[PDB]
Amino acid sequence: PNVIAAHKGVNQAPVPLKMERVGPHDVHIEMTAQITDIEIDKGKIYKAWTFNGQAPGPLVVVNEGDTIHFTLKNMDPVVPHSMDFHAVHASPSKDFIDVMPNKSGTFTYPANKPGVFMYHAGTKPVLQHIANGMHGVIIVKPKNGYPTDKEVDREYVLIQNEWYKYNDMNDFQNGVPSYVVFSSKALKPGDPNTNGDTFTLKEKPLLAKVGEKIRLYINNVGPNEVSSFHVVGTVFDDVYLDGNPNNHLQGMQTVMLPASGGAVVEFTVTRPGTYPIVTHQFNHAQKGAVAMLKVTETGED
Amino acid sequence: PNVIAAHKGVNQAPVPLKMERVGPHDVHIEMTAQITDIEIDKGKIYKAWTFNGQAPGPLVVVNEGDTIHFTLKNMDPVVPHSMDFHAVHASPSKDFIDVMPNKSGTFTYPANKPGVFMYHAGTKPVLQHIANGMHGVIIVKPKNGYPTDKEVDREYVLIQNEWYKYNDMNDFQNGVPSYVVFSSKALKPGDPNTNGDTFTLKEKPLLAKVGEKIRLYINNVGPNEVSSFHVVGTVFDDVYLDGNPNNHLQGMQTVMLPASGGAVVEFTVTRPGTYPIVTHQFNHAQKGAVAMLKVTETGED
Amino acid sequence: PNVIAAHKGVNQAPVPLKMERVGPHDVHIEMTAQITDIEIDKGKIYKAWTFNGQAPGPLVVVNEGDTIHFTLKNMDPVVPHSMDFHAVHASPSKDFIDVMPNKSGTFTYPANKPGVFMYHAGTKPVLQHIANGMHGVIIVKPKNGYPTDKEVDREYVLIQNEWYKYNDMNDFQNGVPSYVVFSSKALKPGDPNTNGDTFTLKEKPLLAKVGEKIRLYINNVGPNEVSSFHVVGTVFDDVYLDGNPNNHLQGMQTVMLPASGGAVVEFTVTRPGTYPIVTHQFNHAQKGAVAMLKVTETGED
Ligand SMILES: [Cu+2]
Ligand SMILES: [Cu+2]
Ligand SMILES: [Cu+2]
Ligand SMILES: [Cu+2]
Ligand SMILES: [Cu+2]
Ligand SMILES: [Cu+2]
Ligand SMILES: [Cu+2]
Ligand SMILES: [Cu+2]
Ligand SMILES: [Cu+2]
């Protein structure tokens, strides 16, 4: 359950995601694997294993049908890391392979399917890499959109994850989570971009305006728990399981998400006030998994 | 993990739900918050935090499009309580607010969406209020019914909940349930109306007649567990997730319910006998979550 | 948590499933209940309570609309056993009854609904019988097939189950699983047929050829956990919940399965390599629930 000697005193500053389109259906993405201290609860630092110094990692957004030319630069001084995108068709033993310390690797694979996909490290033991922070979301936008696109006023991305005792494989396998948390990742400049902690989305709530229809792209990265996702004070008008437009449910109070499962959910906020966003497995909500949406008459705070 | 000193010796007798329609699309509902001893297992009393002296609370049935004018009278001598209906569009910070001891509050909000919705207290810590008994179901009947209405012979309502060590926030967050239980709530005069205990629906089974198609309205209120709902000896002909007629599945053996999730399920019983109703997460079934349906040639016992 | 004295030194050799069609819509099936040592992890023997000396038990495949004439021969010297098929309409108290040691019983019931159904012992306490190994799958093939039948190149059956401390009712109710495992059952001669262990499907992977569309029939028998089923390196093109052709989802990364829940999932493998098959609840994957699919240019190893 200990800290790797070579990580003592290592705290690598966050590095921005690099992404550029190189053709109509081809995108370059470069990420790092790095060791970064994150305050997951007030007064509690976790020396996380991260992509780009965030946990969950940075949001990646591509279009349906894009081929991704992905480079991972491993800045960890001792532990290999790798990348597995749930969005892609790839050979795990050729394309999701380990990149050694202070090396890079480049892999190419297509994102054929629209949706809200988990990404994570694929290095054995996978549980250890996920639990220590190596998870995130890639959104693949559908070529023809969603049937409800014209009704949506505002969009945000939320992610649920757990935290355990530091680097403790016994706890990761057999224990209950110490914290369960939400984070938000920016779809556009100015949106909140946060890490998985117990407090930021309570103290700095997401904003909306009375009468708006909100869309959330959500994924429960786990590693271990399922999620019962609910927004207090509203009902989901439309739900698309895994973000695929064909998996269309209506009028849900709560959306069941497996570990790694995603959804697009849409709902209307009819009155001003503060709306909690929870997992309705309330032991997890009590351990941190409550975010806030503040709805005002103007949409500003 | 203790008993509040002011609740020592308090056992407030159940009070009937009060509901009256005041217009074609407007309904008044008055409930209490009260402290009531419930026998959750033989020889085991839980001094529950309840609505109206039942846990889960009384069934509320309204029509799609009704506006609810809801009054809560708090009879607890020391703890504030509140009401959150998953059925409604409301401002949580204005409409789901605490009512102080020996006060009342009135709130108004619409139920726009059909289905089988959880209700519960919204007072912090929400986990504590739910785990101590402040949960229940509100059914919103669809304006145009369900496509299978003409095939259904009999209807019942079941609810699943957990019980933990008394008022023990550590156990509520980190422990396994001590009991997991079903209760049934009356849709019409004469139907069974019970509390969440390990024994009543085994000793006094629900009744049906050979060849009938039964509909169950079900909700898993939690607080913490998901449910794998199954009726032994049959297969669900039709399932409507959250009770919304558009979320229509067929031929399911078992229905996955998130915490707070609901469904309408319909099935046929072809032969006389006793049919267990379970969560198929069998550790929970062993801890109380088995109800019985007795099917006879006449439908009487 | 002990071994029954009468099972000390008992290790009954596996007996083949007996099945013969006796009419266009009538099938005879004969199974045993027997006590058989299974190596569930390297160096760890579990003296399992089984059907036919396998755990999970043998695969049963029938056609939609078949009536099953089922015989159970109980070879256990002291414990009664029984059979509950989720596929059938039956009276649990008449048709799923106990067969005493060294007796047989015969029961008749129809399989009206297509899908991938759990079977298990129905003897009280059911949790004890399931946890000790008395579970399996019955597939009911749809009369008109699946809409995607013409696209499928290869089929396999996988089952997920847990193992606990030996015959320990406290652990079964309150503990975390010691192991979570996959097994594969043969649809046709030559397919792998294995027991639920931590290693066989890693050391002897399932085979496929580059470019194939694979169909898996899957069921999570539990007893206690839900499953977040995922194949690394691909996305499910089509999913049929519980194997019913009408419950059709597309483009899922991960399929949520309740305890006893099934699915038919189909996906394409585009590149050669080894593809892990997991539950994405990664504590369970770490405890054994990883199988391998080896994809080669020829489909041979
Ligand atoms: Cu390139
Ligand atoms: Cu890593
Ligand atoms: Cu994954
Ligand atoms: Cu009024
Ligand atoms: Cu309360
Ligand atoms: Cu709620
Ligand atoms: Cu016969
Ligand atoms: Cu048995
Ligand atoms: Cu069963």
PDB file of N, CA and C in Angstrom, chain A residues 84 86 88-96 108-109 113 116-118 120 125-127 130 169 172-174 219 223-224 226 242 244 246-247 258-260 262, chain C residues 176-177 226-230 232-237 248-256 268-276 280-284 286-287:
ATOM      1  N   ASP A  84      -5.791   2.815 -23.664  1.00  0.00           N
ATOM      2  CA  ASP A  84      -6.892   2.049 -24.222  1.00  0.00           C
ATOM      3  C   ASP A  84      -8.049   3.032 -24.363  1.00  0.00           C
ATOM      4  N   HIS A  86     -11.946   3.223 -25.378  1.00  0.00           N
ATOM      5  CA  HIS A  86     -13.103   2.381 -25.685  1.00  0.00           C
ATOM      6  C   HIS A  86     -13.760   2.754 -27.002  1.00  0.00           C
ATOM      7  N   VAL A  88     -12.403   3.006 -29.990  1.00  0.00           N
ATOM      8  CA  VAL A  88     -11.726   2.581 -31.214  1.00  0.00           C
ATOM      9  C   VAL A  88     -11.781   1.081 -31.405  1.00  0.00           C
ATOM     10  N   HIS A  89     -11.609   0.688 -32.654  1.00  0.00           N
ATOM     11  CA  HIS A  89     -11.333  -0.691 -33.024  1.00  0.00           C
ATOM     12  C   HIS A  89      -9.829  -0.820 -33.173  1.00  0.00           C
ATOM     13  N   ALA A  90      -9.231  -1.690 -32.383  1.00  0.00           N
ATOM     14  CA  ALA A  90      -7.787  -1.798 -32.365  1.00  0.00           C
ATOM     15  C   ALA A  90      -7.417  -3.182 -31.886  1.00  0.00           C
ATOM     16  N   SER A  91      -6.141  -3.535 -32.074  1.00  0.00           N
ATOM     17  CA  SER A  91      -5.612  -4.782 -31.540  1.00  0.00           C
ATOM     18  C   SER A  91      -5.030  -4.475 -30.170  1.00  0.00           C
ATOM     19  N   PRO A  92      -5.588  -4.993 -29.080  1.00  0.00           N
ATOM     20  CA  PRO A  92      -5.059  -4.587 -27.764  1.00  0.00           C
ATOM     21  C   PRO A  92      -3.600  -4.940 -27.570  1.00  0.00           C
ATOM     22  N   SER A  93      -3.160  -6.067 -28.104  1.00  0.00           N
ATOM     23  CA  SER A  93      -1.786  -6.531 -27.885  1.00  0.00           C
ATOM     24  C   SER A  93      -0.773  -5.884 -28.820  1.00  0.00           C
ATOM     25  N   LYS A  94      -1.223  -5.150 -29.827  1.00  0.00           N
ATOM     26  CA  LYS A  94      -0.338  -4.376 -30.692  1.00  0.00           C
ATOM     27  C   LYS A  94      -0.483  -2.873 -30.521  1.00  0.00           C
ATOM     28  N   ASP A  95      -1.698  -2.387 -30.257  1.00  0.00           N
ATOM     29  CA  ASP A  95      -1.998  -0.962 -30.275  1.00  0.00           C
ATOM     30  C   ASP A  95      -2.181  -0.333 -28.908  1.00  0.00           C
ATOM     31  N   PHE A  96      -2.469  -1.115 -27.881  1.00  0.00           N
ATOM     32  CA  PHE A  96      -2.645  -0.624 -26.513  1.00  0.00           C
ATOM     33  C   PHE A  96      -1.463  -1.051 -25.637  1.00  0.00           C
ATOM     34  N   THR A 108      -2.266   4.174 -34.233  1.00  0.00           N
ATOM     35  CA  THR A 108      -3.284   4.685 -35.152  1.00  0.00           C
ATOM     36  C   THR A 108      -4.479   3.741 -35.194  1.00  0.00           C
ATOM     37  N   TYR A 109      -5.675   4.291 -34.996  1.00  0.00           N
ATOM     38  CA  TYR A 109      -6.875   3.471 -34.968  1.00  0.00           C
ATOM     39  C   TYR A 109      -8.115   4.325 -35.210  1.00  0.00           C
ATOM     40  N   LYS A 113     -17.757   4.754 -34.195  1.00  0.00           N
ATOM     41  CA  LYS A 113     -19.040   4.685 -33.506  1.00  0.00           C
ATOM     42  C   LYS A 113     -19.240   5.945 -32.673  1.00  0.00           C
ATOM     43  N   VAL A 116     -20.057   8.299 -25.915  1.00  0.00           N
ATOM     44  CA  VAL A 116     -19.345   8.848 -24.759  1.00  0.00           C
ATOM     45  C   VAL A 116     -18.568   7.693 -24.137  1.00  0.00           C
ATOM     46  N   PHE A 117     -17.294   7.605 -24.473  1.00  0.00           N
ATOM     47  CA  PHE A 117     -16.488   6.428 -24.222  1.00  0.00           C
ATOM     48  C   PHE A 117     -15.456   6.686 -23.134  1.00  0.00           C
ATOM     49  N   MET A 118     -15.202   5.666 -22.325  1.00  0.00           N
ATOM     50  CA  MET A 118     -14.097   5.714 -21.389  1.00  0.00           C
ATOM     51  C   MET A 118     -12.770   5.496 -22.105  1.00  0.00           C
ATOM     52  N   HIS A 120      -8.568   4.693 -20.650  1.00  0.00           N
ATOM     53  CA  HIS A 120      -7.813   4.380 -19.444  1.00  0.00           C
ATOM     54  C   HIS A 120      -6.526   3.680 -19.837  1.00  0.00           C
ATOM     55  N   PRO A 125      -1.104  -4.256 -13.495  1.00  0.00           N
ATOM     56  CA  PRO A 125      -2.525  -4.585 -13.309  1.00  0.00           C
ATOM     57  C   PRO A 125      -3.390  -3.376 -13.645  1.00  0.00           C
ATOM     58  N   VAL A 126      -4.351  -3.567 -14.546  1.00  0.00           N
ATOM     59  CA  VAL A 126      -5.176  -2.448 -14.997  1.00  0.00           C
ATOM     60  C   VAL A 126      -5.880  -1.777 -13.822  1.00  0.00           C
ATOM     61  N   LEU A 127      -6.368  -2.565 -12.864  1.00  0.00           N
ATOM     62  CA  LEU A 127      -7.039  -1.985 -11.706  1.00  0.00           C
ATOM     63  C   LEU A 127      -6.159  -0.943 -11.028  1.00  0.00           C
ATOM     64  N   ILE A 130      -6.054   2.319 -13.181  1.00  0.00           N
ATOM     65  CA  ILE A 130      -7.310   3.067 -13.141  1.00  0.00           C
ATOM     66  C   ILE A 130      -7.510   3.696 -11.770  1.00  0.00           C
ATOM     67  N   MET A 169      -3.325  -2.079  -3.308  1.00  0.00           N
ATOM     68  CA  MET A 169      -4.007  -3.087  -4.125  1.00  0.00           C
ATOM     69  C   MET A 169      -5.004  -3.915  -3.326  1.00  0.00           C
ATOM     70  N   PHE A 172      -7.984  -1.634  -3.227  1.00  0.00           N
ATOM     71  CA  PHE A 172      -8.576  -1.513  -4.550  1.00  0.00           C
ATOM     72  C   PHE A 172      -9.465  -2.713  -4.873  1.00  0.00           C
ATOM     73  N   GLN A 173      -9.047  -3.908  -4.439  1.00  0.00           N
ATOM     74  CA  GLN A 173      -9.756  -5.152  -4.737  1.00  0.00           C
ATOM     75  C   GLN A 173     -10.914  -5.422  -3.792  1.00  0.00           C
ATOM     76  N   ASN A 174     -10.717  -5.144  -2.508  1.00  0.00           N
ATOM     77  CA  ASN A 174     -11.579  -5.645  -1.450  1.00  0.00           C
ATOM     78  C   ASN A 174     -12.260  -4.580  -0.621  1.00  0.00           C
ATOM     79  N   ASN A 219     -20.045   9.850 -18.004  1.00  0.00           N
ATOM     80  CA  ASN A 219     -19.467   8.519 -17.972  1.00  0.00           C
ATOM     81  C   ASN A 219     -19.066   8.214 -16.541  1.00  0.00           C
ATOM     82  N   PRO A 223     -13.206   2.863 -10.693  1.00  0.00           N
ATOM     83  CA  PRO A 223     -13.047   1.562 -11.360  1.00  0.00           C
ATOM     84  C   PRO A 223     -14.062   0.485 -11.047  1.00  0.00           C
ATOM     85  N   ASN A 224     -14.703   0.525  -9.875  1.00  0.00           N
ATOM     86  CA  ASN A 224     -15.390  -0.649  -9.356  1.00  0.00           C
ATOM     87  C   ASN A 224     -16.895  -0.528  -9.227  1.00  0.00           C
ATOM     88  N   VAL A 226     -20.948   0.814  -9.881  1.00  0.00           N
ATOM     89  CA  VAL A 226     -21.953   1.260 -10.847  1.00  0.00           C
ATOM     90  C   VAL A 226     -22.540   2.566 -10.322  1.00  0.00           C
ATOM     91  N   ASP A 242     -24.932   5.124 -23.845  1.00  0.00           N
ATOM     92  CA  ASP A 242     -23.586   5.221 -24.389  1.00  0.00           C
ATOM     93  C   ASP A 242     -23.437   6.357 -25.390  1.00  0.00           C
ATOM     94  N   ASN A 244     -25.110   6.710 -28.074  1.00  0.00           N
ATOM     95  CA  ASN A 244     -25.487   6.322 -29.422  1.00  0.00           C
ATOM     96  C   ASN A 244     -26.910   6.787 -29.693  1.00  0.00           C
ATOM     97  N   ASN A 246     -29.301   5.840 -31.374  1.00  0.00           N
ATOM     98  CA  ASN A 246     -30.333   4.825 -31.545  1.00  0.00           C
ATOM     99  C   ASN A 246     -30.822   4.249 -30.226  1.00  0.00           C
ATOM    100  N   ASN A 247     -30.104   4.458 -29.122  1.00  0.00           N
ATOM    101  CA  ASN A 247     -30.446   3.829 -27.844  1.00  0.00           C
ATOM    102  C   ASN A 247     -31.210   4.836 -26.991  1.00  0.00           C
ATOM    103  N   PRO A 258     -23.205   1.161 -15.956  1.00  0.00           N
ATOM    104  CA  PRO A 258     -22.182   0.204 -15.531  1.00  0.00           C
ATOM    105  C   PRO A 258     -20.866   0.929 -15.315  1.00  0.00           C
ATOM    106  N   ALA A 259     -19.897   0.220 -14.734  1.00  0.00           N
ATOM    107  CA  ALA A 259     -18.540   0.747 -14.697  1.00  0.00           C
ATOM    108  C   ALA A 259     -18.024   0.816 -16.135  1.00  0.00           C
ATOM    109  N   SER A 260     -17.580   2.008 -16.555  1.00  0.00           N
ATOM    110  CA  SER A 260     -17.166   2.437 -17.901  1.00  0.00           C
ATOM    111  C   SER A 260     -18.341   2.892 -18.758  1.00  0.00           C
ATOM    112  N   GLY A 262     -21.513   5.054 -20.323  1.00  0.00           N
ATOM    113  CA  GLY A 262     -21.801   6.439 -20.589  1.00  0.00           C
ATOM    114  C   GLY A 262     -23.248   6.658 -20.994  1.00  0.00           C
TER     115      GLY A 262
ATOM    116  N   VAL C 176     -17.029 -10.149   0.377  1.00  0.00           N
ATOM    117  CA  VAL C 176     -16.699  -9.885  -1.026  1.00  0.00           C
ATOM    118  C   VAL C 176     -16.293 -11.204  -1.669  1.00  0.00           C
ATOM    119  N   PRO C 177     -16.473 -11.365  -2.969  1.00  0.00           N
ATOM    120  CA  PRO C 177     -16.061 -12.621  -3.594  1.00  0.00           C
ATOM    121  C   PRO C 177     -14.560 -12.828  -3.492  1.00  0.00           C
ATOM    122  N   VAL C 226     -23.380  -7.707  -9.920  1.00  0.00           N
ATOM    123  CA  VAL C 226     -23.757  -7.309 -11.277  1.00  0.00           C
ATOM    124  C   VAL C 226     -22.483  -7.286 -12.114  1.00  0.00           C
ATOM    125  N   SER C 227     -22.629  -7.208 -13.428  1.00  0.00           N
ATOM    126  CA  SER C 227     -21.492  -7.286 -14.329  1.00  0.00           C
ATOM    127  C   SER C 227     -21.524  -6.134 -15.330  1.00  0.00           C
ATOM    128  N   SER C 228     -20.344  -5.610 -15.658  1.00  0.00           N
ATOM    129  CA  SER C 228     -20.174  -4.528 -16.627  1.00  0.00           C
ATOM    130  C   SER C 228     -19.361  -5.107 -17.791  1.00  0.00           C
ATOM    131  N   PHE C 229     -20.034  -5.811 -18.688  1.00  0.00           N
ATOM    132  CA  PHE C 229     -19.350  -6.680 -19.630  1.00  0.00           C
ATOM    133  C   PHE C 229     -18.776  -5.888 -20.807  1.00  0.00           C
ATOM    134  N   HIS C 230     -17.498  -6.114 -21.120  1.00  0.00           N
ATOM    135  CA  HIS C 230     -16.787  -5.323 -22.121  1.00  0.00           C
ATOM    136  C   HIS C 230     -15.753  -6.199 -22.822  1.00  0.00           C
ATOM    137  N   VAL C 232     -12.286  -5.692 -24.902  1.00  0.00           N
ATOM    138  CA  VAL C 232     -11.282  -4.674 -25.171  1.00  0.00           C
ATOM    139  C   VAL C 232     -10.974  -4.656 -26.660  1.00  0.00           C
ATOM    140  N   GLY C 233     -10.831  -3.451 -27.223  1.00  0.00           N
ATOM    141  CA  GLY C 233     -10.444  -3.279 -28.615  1.00  0.00           C
ATOM    142  C   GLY C 233     -11.578  -3.275 -29.623  1.00  0.00           C
ATOM    143  N   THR C 234     -12.828  -3.338 -29.171  1.00  0.00           N
ATOM    144  CA  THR C 234     -13.965  -3.319 -30.067  1.00  0.00           C
ATOM    145  C   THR C 234     -15.113  -2.628 -29.358  1.00  0.00           C
ATOM    146  N   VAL C 235     -16.216  -2.478 -30.075  1.00  0.00           N
ATOM    147  CA  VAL C 235     -17.458  -1.891 -29.576  1.00  0.00           C
ATOM    148  C   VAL C 235     -18.555  -2.855 -30.000  1.00  0.00           C
ATOM    149  N   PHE C 236     -19.574  -3.060 -29.167  1.00  0.00           N
ATOM    150  CA  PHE C 236     -20.633  -3.973 -29.577  1.00  0.00           C
ATOM    151  C   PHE C 236     -21.470  -3.323 -30.672  1.00  0.00           C
ATOM    152  N   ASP C 237     -21.512  -3.951 -31.839  1.00  0.00           N
ATOM    153  CA  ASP C 237     -22.355  -3.449 -32.914  1.00  0.00           C
ATOM    154  C   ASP C 237     -23.822  -3.565 -32.543  1.00  0.00           C
ATOM    155  N   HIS C 248     -33.257  -4.444 -28.628  1.00  0.00           N
ATOM    156  CA  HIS C 248     -32.114  -4.277 -29.535  1.00  0.00           C
ATOM    157  C   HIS C 248     -31.432  -2.924 -29.320  1.00  0.00           C
ATOM    158  N   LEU C 249     -30.195  -2.942 -28.812  1.00  0.00           N
ATOM    159  CA  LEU C 249     -29.372  -1.746 -28.635  1.00  0.00           C
ATOM    160  C   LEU C 249     -28.208  -1.835 -29.611  1.00  0.00           C
ATOM    161  N   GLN C 250     -27.581  -0.694 -29.909  1.00  0.00           N
ATOM    162  CA  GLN C 250     -26.479  -0.645 -30.862  1.00  0.00           C
ATOM    163  C   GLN C 250     -25.324   0.182 -30.317  1.00  0.00           C
ATOM    164  N   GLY C 251     -24.112  -0.187 -30.714  1.00  0.00           N
ATOM    165  CA  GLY C 251     -22.943   0.645 -30.455  1.00  0.00           C
ATOM    166  C   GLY C 251     -22.632   0.851 -28.993  1.00  0.00           C
ATOM    167  N   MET C 252     -22.797  -0.191 -28.171  1.00  0.00           N
ATOM    168  CA  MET C 252     -22.502  -0.115 -26.746  1.00  0.00           C
ATOM    169  C   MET C 252     -21.030  -0.441 -26.514  1.00  0.00           C
ATOM    170  N   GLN C 253     -20.407   0.256 -25.561  1.00  0.00           N
ATOM    171  CA  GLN C 253     -19.060  -0.115 -25.141  1.00  0.00           C
ATOM    172  C   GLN C 253     -19.097  -1.216 -24.108  1.00  0.00           C
ATOM    173  N   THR C 254     -20.124  -1.209 -23.257  1.00  0.00           N
ATOM    174  CA  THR C 254     -20.197  -2.052 -22.074  1.00  0.00           C
ATOM    175  C   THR C 254     -21.659  -2.347 -21.804  1.00  0.00           C
ATOM    176  N   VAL C 255     -21.960  -3.590 -21.447  1.00  0.00           N
ATOM    177  CA  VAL C 255     -23.336  -4.014 -21.215  1.00  0.00           C
ATOM    178  C   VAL C 255     -23.522  -4.302 -19.732  1.00  0.00           C
ATOM    179  N   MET C 256     -24.490  -3.621 -19.133  1.00  0.00           N
ATOM    180  CA  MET C 256     -24.849  -3.822 -17.733  1.00  0.00           C
ATOM    181  C   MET C 256     -25.706  -5.070 -17.601  1.00  0.00           C
ATOM    182  N   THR C 268     -17.137  -6.843 -34.037  1.00  0.00           N
ATOM    183  CA  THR C 268     -16.191  -7.149 -35.097  1.00  0.00           C
ATOM    184  C   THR C 268     -14.773  -6.992 -34.572  1.00  0.00           C
ATOM    185  N   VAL C 269     -13.891  -7.894 -34.972  1.00  0.00           N
ATOM    186  CA  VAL C 269     -12.476  -7.812 -34.620  1.00  0.00           C
ATOM    187  C   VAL C 269     -11.710  -7.503 -35.901  1.00  0.00           C
ATOM    188  N   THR C 270     -11.034  -6.368 -35.923  1.00  0.00           N
ATOM    189  CA  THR C 270     -10.505  -5.825 -37.170  1.00  0.00           C
ATOM    190  C   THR C 270      -9.024  -6.100 -37.406  1.00  0.00           C
ATOM    191  N   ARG C 271      -8.277  -6.484 -36.382  1.00  0.00           N
ATOM    192  CA  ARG C 271      -6.822  -6.625 -36.450  1.00  0.00           C
ATOM    193  C   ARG C 271      -6.396  -7.869 -35.689  1.00  0.00           C
ATOM    194  N   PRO C 272      -5.302  -8.505 -36.084  1.00  0.00           N
ATOM    195  CA  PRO C 272      -4.814  -9.652 -35.307  1.00  0.00           C
ATOM    196  C   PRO C 272      -4.300  -9.240 -33.936  1.00  0.00           C
ATOM    197  N   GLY C 273      -4.447 -10.147 -32.976  1.00  0.00           N
ATOM    198  CA  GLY C 273      -3.901  -9.955 -31.651  1.00  0.00           C
ATOM    199  C   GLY C 273      -4.751 -10.673 -30.626  1.00  0.00           C
ATOM    200  N   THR C 274      -4.469 -10.375 -29.363  1.00  0.00           N
ATOM    201  CA  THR C 274      -5.176 -10.960 -28.240  1.00  0.00           C
ATOM    202  C   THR C 274      -6.040  -9.879 -27.605  1.00  0.00           C
ATOM    203  N   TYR C 275      -7.330 -10.182 -27.463  1.00  0.00           N
ATOM    204  CA  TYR C 275      -8.355  -9.252 -27.009  1.00  0.00           C
ATOM    205  C   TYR C 275      -8.879  -9.709 -25.655  1.00  0.00           C
ATOM    206  N   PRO C 276      -8.619  -8.992 -24.568  1.00  0.00           N
ATOM    207  CA  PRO C 276      -9.218  -9.372 -23.283  1.00  0.00           C
ATOM    208  C   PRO C 276     -10.714  -9.124 -23.274  1.00  0.00           C
ATOM    209  N   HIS C 280     -15.857  -4.834 -16.374  1.00  0.00           N
ATOM    210  CA  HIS C 280     -15.152  -3.576 -16.180  1.00  0.00           C
ATOM    211  C   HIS C 280     -15.242  -3.054 -14.757  1.00  0.00           C
ATOM    212  N   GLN C 281     -15.915  -3.787 -13.875  1.00  0.00           N
ATOM    213  CA  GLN C 281     -15.779  -3.599 -12.435  1.00  0.00           C
ATOM    214  C   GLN C 281     -14.451  -4.245 -12.077  1.00  0.00           C
ATOM    215  N   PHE C 282     -13.399  -3.430 -12.025  1.00  0.00           N
ATOM    216  CA  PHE C 282     -12.062  -3.972 -12.188  1.00  0.00           C
ATOM    217  C   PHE C 282     -11.546  -4.718 -10.971  1.00  0.00           C
ATOM    218  N   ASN C 283     -12.157  -4.519  -9.804  1.00  0.00           N
ATOM    219  CA  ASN C 283     -11.843  -5.395  -8.682  1.00  0.00           C
ATOM    220  C   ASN C 283     -12.191  -6.848  -8.999  1.00  0.00           C
ATOM    221  N   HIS C 284     -13.288  -7.077  -9.725  1.00  0.00           N
ATOM    222  CA  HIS C 284     -13.668  -8.430 -10.109  1.00  0.00           C
ATOM    223  C   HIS C 284     -12.758  -8.971 -11.209  1.00  0.00           C
ATOM    224  N   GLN C 286      -9.630  -8.209 -11.565  1.00  0.00           N
ATOM    225  CA  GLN C 286      -8.393  -8.556 -10.887  1.00  0.00           C
ATOM    226  C   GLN C 286      -8.489  -9.887 -10.151  1.00  0.00           C
ATOM    227  N   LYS C 287      -9.685 -10.249  -9.686  1.00  0.00           N
ATOM    228  CA  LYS C 287      -9.931 -11.497  -8.983  1.00  0.00           C
ATOM    229  C   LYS C 287     -10.286 -12.661  -9.912  1.00  0.00           C
TER     230      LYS C 287
END
